[PDB]
Nucleic acid binder design. Structure first.
Ligand SMILES: [Mg+2]
Ligand SMILES: [Mg+2]
Ligand SMILES: [Mg+2]
Ligand SMILES: [Mg+2]
Ligand SMILES: [Mg+2]
Ligand SMILES: [Mg+2]
Ligand SMILES: [Mg+2]
Ligand SMILES: [Mg+2]
Ligand SMILES: [Mg+2]
Ligand SMILES: [Mg+2]
Ligand SMILES: [Mg+2]
Ligand SMILES: [Mg+2]
Ligand SMILES: [Mg+2]
Ligand SMILES: [Mg+2]
Ligand SMILES: [Mg+2]
Ligand SMILES: [Mg+2]
Ligand SMILES: [Mg+2]
Ligand SMILES: [Mg+2]
Ligand SMILES: [Mg+2]
Ligand SMILES: [Mg+2]
Lengths: 202, 156, 104
RNA sequence: GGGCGUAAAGCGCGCGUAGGCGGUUUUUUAAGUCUGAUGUGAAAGCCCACGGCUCAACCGUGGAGGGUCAUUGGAAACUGGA
RNA sequence: GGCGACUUUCUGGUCUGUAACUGACGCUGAUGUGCGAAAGCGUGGGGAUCAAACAGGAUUAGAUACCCUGGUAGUCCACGCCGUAAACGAUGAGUGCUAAGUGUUAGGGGGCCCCUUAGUGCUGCAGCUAACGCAUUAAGCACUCCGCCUGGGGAGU
RNA sequence: GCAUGGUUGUCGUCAGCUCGUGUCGUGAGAUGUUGGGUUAAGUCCCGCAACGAGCGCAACCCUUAAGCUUAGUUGCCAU
RNA sequence: GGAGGUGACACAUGAUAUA
RNA sequence: UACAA
């Protein structure tokens, strides 16, 4: 019913996360990209990674990792990023250079806020309290608006439902509005809980 | 400061072209246990948000309850609509002999000793409004001595 | 300033202050010593919201033109009588005026 | 210590008997009313106090209470009688 | 309950003013006794219109109806009976007290207006009410008497 | 798929649906959002115990219809 | 503007709880 | 959905 807010704005006011060109090796490079994105998600699942950008040029892959906690990705003395770079050069057989970009104010990042809620829901936290706390935090940091939604068997109820909260303005029809969006899943004993977060900075 | 007690939480519904739209009504009594009591109501889709609205509204209609050594100066019946609450002074050993929302109102007023009977509607909002009505009409001896132009001793 | 409204509409509570009825000029002088646009609902009781519009007026042209013009008086009295001085004609209620001036 | 416009509940409406109730004042009475006295309201019981049961139940002792009771002396505002 | 052309005869009640008179002679009212729309019943008249029943014609899947054409009782009168209605203001009677404004009916007093009685309407405070609303014609505030109610159905059987 | 996440159809591009504060109501609720006009539109103005706000409408995005500057190949061809 | 009086072709049906 | 037919 409601279009993905990111997908509607891709190539309009939002940039592609994959920045390379190819014609006949497009499929092979696309799936090497997806191989890398799956590797980074698994290997840095505790490092608060918002998103990953991939640039390709001259048998070299430049990977930018936007992370809430950059000291965990780099590691004490650059040792953790050297180990990840060595494993990426084995998944790829190309020369990978990794850049790390700290994202201050992790409470204004939809992906980090969505995954934090999902992690708390897995710890049996109140599906209401986690949404309200996340909204209060983002608005205190100057967010123009925020919307949260948790869908599924809330609190182990036998009948699934969706509870959503909002504050400020989240103008999903305004094309020029840069609306950050993310979906995350919480693995509970009762199945999947879907977390959706919309953040509008301005 | 003021202590507050949630007397009743009611889920109410209004019907629309779809199904039903639900809200939550909170009836709350506030009081300091030192002769100032008040009740308020608030409505919201969330129970805690309705409570805060009810608490805030209660602070705007605090009442001054006359007392003599922890008891009321005389018997009274408070009536609001169908609600009617009989209140009688009791000895200091006696506790608050009250049934429902009356107990919340009298306790937060600072009574600790009273004989009360709810003779009428048991709907909590109207029982609460009846209780406040009876406390609003209590008169201490020093006040009625002033209006009659006598001293307190001459009243007896 | 002492000829009030017609007899067929005079409030009964203005009998002391009062063809047509003529106000108590003698009583108004002793009372006077004791003492333009639409009134927005909640001007006084909703200052938590009006001040935002007052602040937003200080800080668009279409809004300001009506805002400047903006920022019979029964709305105002309730905003004040519920919070716990004014010319009170015969048709007006005197029991809700702290300092009633019984002048036309 | 409740009600009867619409929730159960005003007879369809008169006339009128018994009964109930009844305007102001003065005098009088003393049935109601009020206030004492005397007698009586058994004992056991209930309640209070004390004593005996190791405690307690229980038992015992001394009080209190319970009448619309009767008889008798006063009061006279109200209800009743003249 | 009801009462609507006009005339005469017989007859009931109410209202206003006055303050001759009587001097509490009052209020209510179980039982009781009367009056009581329409339909209906009896006897006897009358019979225009309308019209249960009924007949025919339509409509309809059917139409024992609604619509059309007729039509009997009845509708009318007298004298008896019946005694029931959403017989309603769904509000018993009596008495007094409690803001105003404004129509109207029948009077009176004073200078068309002001005051005042008694009815009849609308609006509207205080108060009352569950609300709707009532509000000097109370559903307000009081006293007296009567009637009546105590979950729905069964059953006003 | 009547335990679910995600994704989709449908009413339906219908113009509506709400919230905060205030105020009115014992209360469910109401108001705002109704009324006078106007619009494709809860679009806009006026009045109004409402004042504001949000999700919607619209606008910001793509393309099509006209012109200008830059550029002239693999496009075009007037001298 | 709101009341009170006054007057003014045909279309049948849709099991129980749970909602 | 579980039923009924
Ligand atoms: Mg009862
Ligand atoms: Mg009665
Ligand atoms: Mg009925
Ligand atoms: Mg009834
Ligand atoms: Mg009657
Ligand atoms: Mg009857
Ligand atoms: Mg013993
Ligand atoms: Mg007459
Ligand atoms: Mg009588
Ligand atoms: Mg009788
Ligand atoms: Mg007849
Ligand atoms: Mg016929
Ligand atoms: Mg006949
Ligand atoms: Mg006859
Ligand atoms: Mg009746
Ligand atoms: Mg009466
Ligand atoms: Mg009366
Ligand atoms: Mg009225
Ligand atoms: Mg009159
Ligand atoms: Mg648009």
């Amino acid at each position: 019913q409601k279009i993905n807010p990111i997908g509607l704005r891709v190539g309009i006011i939002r940039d592609w996360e994959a920045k390379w060109y190819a014609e006949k090796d497009f499929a092979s490079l696309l799936h090497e990209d997806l191989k890398i994105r799956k590797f980074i998600d698994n290997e840095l699942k505790e490092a608060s990674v918002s998103h990953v950008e991939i640039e390709r040029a001259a048998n070299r892959i430049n990977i930018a990792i936007h992370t809430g906690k950059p000291g965990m990705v780099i590691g004490k003395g650059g040792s953790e990023i050297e180990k990840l770079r060595n494993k990426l050069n084995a998944l790829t057989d190309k020369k990978v250079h990794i850049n790390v970009i700290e994202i201050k104010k992790v409470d204004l990042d939809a992906r980090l806020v969505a995954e934090n809620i999902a992690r708390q829901l897995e710890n049996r936290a109140s599906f209401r309290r986690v949404q309200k706390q996340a909204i209060t935090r983002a608005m205190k940091l100057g967010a123009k608006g925020i919307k949260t939604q948790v869908s599924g068997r809330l609190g182990g109820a036998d009948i699934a439902r969706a509870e959503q909260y909002s504050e400020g303005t989240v103008p999903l029809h305004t094309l020029r509005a840069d609306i950050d969006y993310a979906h995350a899943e919480a693995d509970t004993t009762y199945g999947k809980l879907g977390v959706k977060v919309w953040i509008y900075r301005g | 400061e003021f202590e507050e007690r949630v007397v009743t939480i009611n889920r109410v519904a209004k019907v629309v072209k779809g199904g039903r739209r639900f809200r939550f009504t909170a009836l709350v009594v506030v009081g300091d246990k030192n002769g100032r009591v008040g009740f308020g109501t608030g409505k919201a889709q969330e129970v805690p948000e309705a409570i805060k609205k009810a608490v805030e509204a209660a602070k705007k209609d605090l009442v001054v309850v006359p007392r003599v050594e922890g008891t009321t100066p005389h018997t009274i019946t408070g009536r609001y609509g169908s609600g009617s609450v009989f209140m009688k002074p009791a000895a200091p050993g006696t506790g608050v002999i009250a049934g429902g929302p009356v107990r919340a109102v009298l306790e937060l007023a600072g009574i600790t000793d009273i004989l009360s009977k709810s003779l009428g509607s048991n709907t909590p909002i109207n029982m609460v409004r009846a209780t406040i009505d009876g406390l609003q009409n209590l008169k201490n001896a020093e006040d009625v001595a002033k209006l009659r132009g006598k001293t307190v001793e001459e009243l007896y | 300033v002492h000829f009030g409204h017609q007899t067929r509409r005079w409030n009964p509570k203005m009998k002391k202050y009062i063809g047509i009825y003529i106000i108590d000029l003698q009583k108004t002088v002793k009372k006077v010593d004791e003492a333009n646009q639409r009134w927005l609902g909640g001007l006084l009781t909703n200052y938590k919201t009006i001040s935002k519009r007052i602040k937003r007026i200080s800080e668009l042209k279409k809004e300001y033109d009506r805002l400047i013009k903006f920022l019979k008086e029964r709305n105002a009295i309730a905003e004040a009588r519920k919070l716990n001085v004014g010319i009170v004609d015969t048709n007006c209620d005197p029991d809700e005026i702290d300092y009633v001036i019984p002048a036309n």
